[PDB]
Design a protein around this ligand. Structure first.
Ligand SMILES: [Ca+2]
Length: 156
C-alpha cells in the first residue's frame, strides 16, 4: 500500500488558539503546487486521513481542488501534533490488510517525522517543511520502505 505522508501548509502566526490557526496565502499556494505535482506523477488516492486542526483540513481543501480525492475524509484525533504514532501505524496496517491501495495522511510535526521512523525500520525521523510529502510503501506486516520526499522549495 502506498502511503503519502504530508505536513500541512504554512499557517498564520496568530489566531485565538493553535487548533484554529488558518493557512496563509503562501500555505495555500505551496499546497496546490504539491497537489499539482502529485497529479503529474499519475497518483490516485483511495483514502484520506487528516488531523482535526483547521490548518490540516484547509490543506486537504486546497489539495482536493487540484487532485481527485474521495468524497469523505477520516478525521483522526491521533493525527494532532501530539498524537500516538502507534495508533496511526495500527490504523494504516488495518487498511493495508483491508486491501486499500493508497492513502494520503495530512498531519503535523513532530508526528509526521516519527511516523516515517515507526513505519520504516532503520530510518531516523526526517525533517518536513510545510506541504512536504514523503512516500512510503507498506506491506501487510506493518514494515515499510521510505521511497522519497518532495518539498515546495524543490519544485520551485
Ligand atoms: Ca481544479
Amino acid at each position: 500500500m502506498q502511503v503519502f505522508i504530508m505536513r500541512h501548509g504554512d499557517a498564520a502566526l496568530d489566531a485565538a488558539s493553535d487548533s484554529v490557526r488558518p493557512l496563509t496565502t503562501n500555505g495555500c499556494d505551496e499546497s496546490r503546487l504539491m497537489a499539482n505535482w502529485l497529479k503529474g506523477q499519475k497518483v490516485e488516492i483511495e483514502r484520506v486521513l487528516v488531523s482535526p486542526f483547521l490548518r490540516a483540513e484547509q490543506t486537504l481543501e486546497e489539495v482536493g481542488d487540484c487532485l481527485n480525492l474521495p468524497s469523505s475524509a477520516e478525521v483522526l484525533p491521533e493525527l494532532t501534533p501530539c498524537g500516538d504514532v502507534g495508533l496511526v501505524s495500527a490504523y494504516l496496517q488495518a487498511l493495508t490488510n483491508e486491501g486499500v491501495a493508497s492513502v494520503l495522511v495530512i498531519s503535523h510535526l513532530p508526528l509526521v517525522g516519527y511516523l516515517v521512523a515507526e513505519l520504516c525500520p532503520g530510518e531516523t525521523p526526517p525533517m518536513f517543511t510545510t506541504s512536504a510529502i514523503a512516500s512510503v510503501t507498506l506491506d501487510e506486516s506493518g514494515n515499510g520502505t521510505f521511497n522519497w520526499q518532495m518539498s515546495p522549495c524543490n519544485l520551485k
